[PDB]
Design a protein around this ligand. Structure first.
Ligand SMILES: CC(C)[C@@H]1[N@@H+](Cc2ccc3c(NC[C@]4(O)CCCN(c5cc(NCc6ccccc6)ncn5)C4)cccc3c2)CC12CCC2
Lengths: 243, 196
């Protein structure tokens, strides 16, 4: 069966036909007992001195609002994103997960990762199904219909698959699948976790969220650093808390 | 000449100027991740093969970056990226951090191609794994719907890749099989004793 021919026939994307799309439970519980209280801070990140965010972070999730997320609807250009001083708040060993979209971000987002000093180790793909709606408006450069987004993973310093399959969100809904959070937390990369350009709807235990549209803030740098003072400085986030 | 054609050779040393221009070029290189070093991939004479059209370039691991390098050095802008979701015969899905469910194929444009059927397919392939290192036949159907009847050239193909309207080059092909008269003409002129 040629699903590409089938999509040309019927408007059903090939990913519509992927099927199915342990001890993992215990690891999830250890993550959940390990998680810091959620913390969040409204900040216009264009105008915001990033260095106020301390301590340096083990994980950075970066979800800038690309103009392409608003097909039928302040956007950030890759120009703006590349100027963020991401390297000033990243720990010497740390990880970045950058949502790149499906256009020039696949290239420009790689330039950022190198500019901030990371090498890319994984290319995580959000494949969007259209089971509930067998039509697209193409970017002028596009050769094919774009049915996916890329979240690039980066490492600097010394269980899950690289696919997320969900149904295409409603027009003007820009949320990324919450599955990206499970993939991250399962890596057990440390507990200082920053989500840049989060929203009220993305706040989450174990995470600090900073964004222009947050309606409330609770961030205090000294309180936040208190969660990781000894004897907690190096926990993976997947181990039992120290008494 | 519409039926399959091929040239067993070393793509490093073949004078590809004899082959003419192609609406589509596809390459599935053996990346140094019988491989080629990175300088041998940069120096491949891709730029002569096309004036206007598309390049399909499979990549993996660090050739994800390096293939973007060759792609740009060779004169292309990357305009799309196809991913193939690997399944079994029952449509379930099959890098030291995450398990890999896909292979990547960069899509690059050169010049100004006109009369192509952009938008017909979508950038995801779902299809069953065949041999090791064996790309899915669906890409040929997508490439034929995008640019029907035009000439296409595949670099680093194996015998199973030979397709109508395509000229396959690779060092595991059986001999030289050429039917287009101009290609036969330029091939005998440049290679009178049939040795490359
Ligand atoms: C996602 C992609 C990236 C992944 N690809 C990986 C892949 C691609 C092709 C594979 C293959 N191709 C057949 C070859 O002929 C075999 C030999 C090498 N080569 C050459 C080289 C050459 N000059 C140098 C030279 C000559 C002589 C002696 C030394 C050096 N001249 C002509 N041909 C190609 C054969 C076996 C495995 C391959 C794996 C596959 C994908 C798509 C799905 C995954």
């Amino acid at each position: 069966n040629d699903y590409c021919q089938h999509f040309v026939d019927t408007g059903h994307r090939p990913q519509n036909f992927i099927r199915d799309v342990e001890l993992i439970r215990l690891k999830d519980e250890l993550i959940a007992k390990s998680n810091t209280p959620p913390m969040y801070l409204q900040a216009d990140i264009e105008a915001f001195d990033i260095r106020e965010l301390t301590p340096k972070f083990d994980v950075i999730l970066l979800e800038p609002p690309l103009e392409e997320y608003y097909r039928e609807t302040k956007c950030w250009t890759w120009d703006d994103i590349m100027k963020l001083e991401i390297d000033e708040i990243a720990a010497p060993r740390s990880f970045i997960f950058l949502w790149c979209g499906s256009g020039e971000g696949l290239d420009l987002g790689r330039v950022c990762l190198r500019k901030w000093g990371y090498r890319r180790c994984e290319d995580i793909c959000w494949i969007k199904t259209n089971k509930n709606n067998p039509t697209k408006t193409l970017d002028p450069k596009a050769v094919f219909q774009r049915t996916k987004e890329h979240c690039l993973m980066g490492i600097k310093g010394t269980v899950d698959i690289d696919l997320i399959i969900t149904e295409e969100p409603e027009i003007g809904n820009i949320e990324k699948p919450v599955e990206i959070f499970h993939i991250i937390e399962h890596f057990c990369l440390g507990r200082r976790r920053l989500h840049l350009f989060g929203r009220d709807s993305t706040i989450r235990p174990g995470w600090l969220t900073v964004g222009p549209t947050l309606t409330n803030s609770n961030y205090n740098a000294e309180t936040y650093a208190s969660y990781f003072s000894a004897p907690n400085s190096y926990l993976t986030g997947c181990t039992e808390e120290i008494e | 000449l519409f039926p399959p054609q091929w040239i067993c050779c070393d793509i490093r040393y073949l004078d590809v100027s004899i082959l003419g221009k192609f609406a589509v070029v596809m390459a599935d290189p053996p990346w140094d991740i019988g491989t080629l070093t990175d300088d041998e991939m940069r120096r491949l004479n891709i730029p002569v093969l096309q004036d206007d059209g598309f390049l399909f370039l499979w990549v993996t691991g660090r050739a994800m970056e390096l293939g973007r390098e060759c792609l740009n050095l060779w004169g292309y802008e990357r305009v799309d990226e196809i991913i193939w979701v690997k399944t079994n015969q029952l449509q379930r899905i099959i890098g030291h951090w995450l398990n890999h469910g896909k292979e990547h194929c960069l899509v690059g444009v050169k010049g100004n191609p006109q009369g192509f059927n952009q938008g017909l397919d979508c950038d995801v392939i779902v299809a069953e794994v065949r041999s090791t290192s064996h790309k899915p036949d669906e890409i040929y159907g997508m490439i034929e719907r995008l640019s029907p009847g035009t000439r296409k050239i595949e670099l680093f193909g194996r015998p199973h890749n030979v397709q109508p309207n395509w000229i396959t080059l690779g060092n595991q092909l059986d001999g030289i099989h050429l039917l287009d008269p101009d290609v036969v003409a330029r091939f005998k002129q440049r290679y009178p004793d049939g040795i490359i």
